[PDB]
Amino acid sequence: VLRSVNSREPSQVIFCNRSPRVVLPVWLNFDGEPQPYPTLPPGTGRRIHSYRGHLWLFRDAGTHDGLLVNQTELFVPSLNVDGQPIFANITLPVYTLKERCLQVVRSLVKPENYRRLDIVRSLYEDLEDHPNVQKDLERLTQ
Amino acid sequence: VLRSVNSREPSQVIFCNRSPRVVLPVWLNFDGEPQPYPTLPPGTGRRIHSYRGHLWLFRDAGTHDGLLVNQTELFVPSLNVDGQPIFANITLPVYTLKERCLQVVRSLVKPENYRRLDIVRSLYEDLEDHPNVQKDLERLTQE
Amino acid sequence: VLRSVNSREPSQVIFCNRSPRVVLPVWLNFDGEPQPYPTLPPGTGRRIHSYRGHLWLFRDAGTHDGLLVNQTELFVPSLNVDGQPIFANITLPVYTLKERCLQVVRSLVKPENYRRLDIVRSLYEDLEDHPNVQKDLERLT
Amino acid sequence: VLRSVNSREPSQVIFCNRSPRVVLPVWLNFDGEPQPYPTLPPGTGRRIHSYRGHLWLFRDAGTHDGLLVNQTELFVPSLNVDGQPIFANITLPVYTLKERCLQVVRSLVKPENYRRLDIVRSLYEDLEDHPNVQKDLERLTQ
Amino acid sequence: MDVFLMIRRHKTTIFTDAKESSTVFELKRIVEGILKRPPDEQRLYKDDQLLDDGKTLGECGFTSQTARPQAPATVGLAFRADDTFEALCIEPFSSPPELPDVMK
């Protein structure tokens, strides 16, 4: 469903991390399979080569939390007009307070010790629902 | 000593009773003698005619308890500015607890039965030492 | 000092009240005594008869507030060249803010209730020193 | 010694209170006697009439604490050039730390309880010698 | 407006004043400074009615004209014995003797 097109038409892009987190770039290959690419430290940028019609999304490298690129979920390289590269602005979403609390707790509690916290059973299942790219791709595919 | 001065210069005064007691106004003559004047029920007022330099004090009509006028013991009619009369605010003093207790006992016991109460002789002599104006006038004269 | 010359020379004048106030024309007599003449309602004007060398001053009729005539304090009728009358423009001076404030309060408080005002006692002495013609004549002298 | 001279020569003065204290203006007469004048609230100004060679000083109206006028103790009206009045800038002195503590304690304890404070006998005599204009005048004379 | 109060618990009676606009919790802070017990362990009563922390003393019926210096209002206090709050107990004051005959 969600796939890169093998156009073979190159396109230069600036990957620009405007977030306090280390960013994992994820490219959706021709089979639709997510492939991780080199990470970008917070506040850094890199000039990369890709192609027109390719699909990319971006996550936190340590937790796989979803991130925004140009205020949307998916980024598709276009044609470089006048040699100017396409600029990809990776930023933090405005998370819900619930997701933000889950992130902080996941970073503080080992996965084995989730069911030992004094919370409702529902939040233990929420803590185990760690963000993962493959699952969300199927949600959009449906 | 404490006397009114025969000035012959009129002065209109408001006698304002801001006390729960019936007030007896007392004018000190040019000879120093206390003269009783008409009484005022609680919360009442009267417009009177006096004179500059005259001396007045105020007591309870039933017990001769001391009262305050403009937060002091004696009131002297002064000059009426723009014809406006002078205001005499007759109010309760903050009595000592002992003097206030004596007042209640005097009001409940006949003087004849003072020496029958179970108290020290000192408190009996104090109950018999009922407020009296001349006494107080000589005390202020000493001051 | 300040008196009018008995020159016996007629001289016609236009007393023009360019002020919001009722005007009192004051002529100084030969003895130097001020003599007041008929008032002039605001915005009016009259052709009058006086003489060369006579001294005139103008005030508010109700308050004796000093007023300017031809940009100055005193007017003196001059020579009627070719039958033109001499013109006298009575205008409001630029009062200081204090005098105008003294004016407004004076116009509002009876002279006995000055001492009942919530103001410094110096201002009580100012409110009573209201304008006075003989006062101004002694000042110039 | 310290007295005003009768010059009969007028001089207009601005009294400008740039202090947080209510200021008492004190004029020393031709005999040297201090005369108190109308007080000035903090941050206020007044245009007054005085004379060449007259002597003026300024104190706290409630405590007679010393204050400065044009950064010194005494003020002498000089020539009004072009009719412009002379400017008297009344400010706080930089009190010694000891005197300033005495000021706070004096404002908090009634004089009757000075000898009840737990201090050295020297400090009790220091609290009772509260500022006095005549005393300061004879000190400047000496 | 000033209100004058007797806060009573058992044989303990505290005389103090507060504002008609002051809250019940601020009164608990005053009891805390005196008897050294935190507000969490305090419960204040007007007669039998439990007083809520946020309401003002005026709202709870303590007014400058009923809580007077010469005749203050009574506010009951009950402390918390670790996990259970005690019942409200205000011990009465002594009783006066019979009026002597000379006063009847």
Next chain:
Amino acid sequence: MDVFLMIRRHKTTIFTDAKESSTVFELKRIVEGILKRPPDEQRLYKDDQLLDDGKTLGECGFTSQTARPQAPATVGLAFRADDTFEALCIEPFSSPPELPDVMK
């Protein structure tokens, strides 16, 4: 002939003069010289009506006989906070007390 104006914003009041032939833009330049904010970031009002930069003051109803030195006319001022213009806010002056009795 000159018109005398009060340019008012919040608790700020500017006293200035201009001519009936002057434009609203030129007035905004005077303000810029005073408050150091450019005309594109300013909005001027006569009462609640927005004034157009190109119109002359005479056109917008400011005349030599209503905008007087001893009683100037009020022109509202509104600045642009970042990207959005603020509302026109003019703080009233203090209110005088009641007339003393001897003056009534």
Next chain:
Amino acid sequence: MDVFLMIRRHKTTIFTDAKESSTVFELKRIVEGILKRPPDEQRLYKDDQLLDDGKTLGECGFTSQTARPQAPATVGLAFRADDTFEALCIEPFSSPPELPDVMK
């Protein structure tokens, strides 16, 4: 610039924003609309320092980079009891419990 502020008095906390150029008095006008007390009866504090009505928020050290939406700056508030202003009192928030073992 927008600055984000916590106005705190006793157990009362107002969350509001203003401009870095806005003044202490306009901020008091915001308190007036909420707590129904005139600016005359209010004193605002940065820590223990009394703030002057005419000063701007930037001047009092309230800046967009220290007064943040997710971490606002605290401004103390003190009201006037009858004739005297109360002392500045800000009740602290509740303190959190100990970290659980699985979180240590």
Next chain:
Amino acid sequence: MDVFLMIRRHKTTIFTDAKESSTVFELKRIVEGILKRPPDEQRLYKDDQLLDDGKTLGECGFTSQTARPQAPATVGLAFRADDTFEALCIEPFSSPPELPDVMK
């Protein structure tokens, strides 16, 4: 202008002055001259907020009218023992006694 500061770490208190234009890094350089610790091993805080090396003291909310000689502003200090920075700990000052009755 000039700002007057107390740099606080544990029981250490440094009294110094700087400019509103000075940066946090330059302030760390003065701490280096006094406490003999390089700026890389220093972290400066305003209350709980970390101060960034490049920002000016004015930007971080330290202004001449809040950082006064008679009442300086407090800046927290935290050192690196080797690779880890310690938490901020500013030891409180001593507590004053209660007031004599003759003084209350």
Next chain:
Amino acid sequence: MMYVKLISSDGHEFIVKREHALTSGTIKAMLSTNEVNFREIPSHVLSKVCMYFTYKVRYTNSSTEIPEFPIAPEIALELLMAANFLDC
């Protein structure tokens, strides 16, 4: 401010502001502690005494109309003796 405790004959403990208690010169001497025992004054008297302290501080040197201090007849004799001993 500071508070003092006044204990009656019956065990009742009345906590009043120290300045209020210092009105009574007798109590002043008994303190120079923060507590005093009165082995002759019952609670129904000492409470009315404590109200009197509040009344004296509140209305002394006031232009506002002073209200009567009320004393019930049944306690008048015991309050009288207490007031004589406390000199208030």
Next chain:
Amino acid sequence: MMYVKLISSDGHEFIVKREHALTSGTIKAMLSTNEVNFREIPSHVLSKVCMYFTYKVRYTNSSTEIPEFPIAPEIALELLMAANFLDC
């Protein structure tokens, strides 16, 4: 503007702008009233709830770099339980 009051379990009263509070559909429903009481959310948690309202209103729909929402570890669990009940 329009303001609403949120009272925590320990009595602290938080006044926020109504538009900021309408972020939580839960709070919006609980208001349609100018006051809401939370008998289980303490002030150390409810204060951060109001900060989140401000942070959300400010940074929603922003190209400018949004900063992280800061949550101290000591309050992470109690804020989580609060956020689950309010679903915000």
Next chain:
Amino acid sequence: MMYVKLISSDGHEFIVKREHALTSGTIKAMLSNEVNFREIPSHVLSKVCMYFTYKVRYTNSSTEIPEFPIAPEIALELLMAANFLDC
């Protein structure tokens, strides 16, 4: 032109031209670009500035000078203000 700021007791800020303000030698002395008057409220200081403009406009003028208008409700405070500033 150069402007001066006059701040009243209630915080209102009045910006007037320096030349108009130099009318009062009092103000000129208080300048040697902002002066704060903690005794003069805004309903008074506003007409004070109105007086500045009126004086500069009508001093040395032959054209008919109008009255300086003063409402009764403020007459007393401006009088007290004018006595101290002597303008």
Next chain:
Amino acid sequence: MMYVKLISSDGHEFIVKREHALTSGTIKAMLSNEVNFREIPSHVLSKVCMYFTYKVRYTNSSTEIPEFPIAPEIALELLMAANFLDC
């Protein structure tokens, strides 16, 4: 410049400029780069150290000098310290 340390009774260590500290001749005598003050708590020395800054700043100043602030609860102990330090 040179810096000196003033150590209070409860162990607090105050780092002040040397020039500011010699204001007090008492301290100057105790130096001729560290001093211990028994009897002087940290809540008193803090204000002393601040007084120095205030004095150096507003001494001989045309700019309006502010009140030096001393809280009532500490006024007595600072007085004795000021008496001993002669500042």
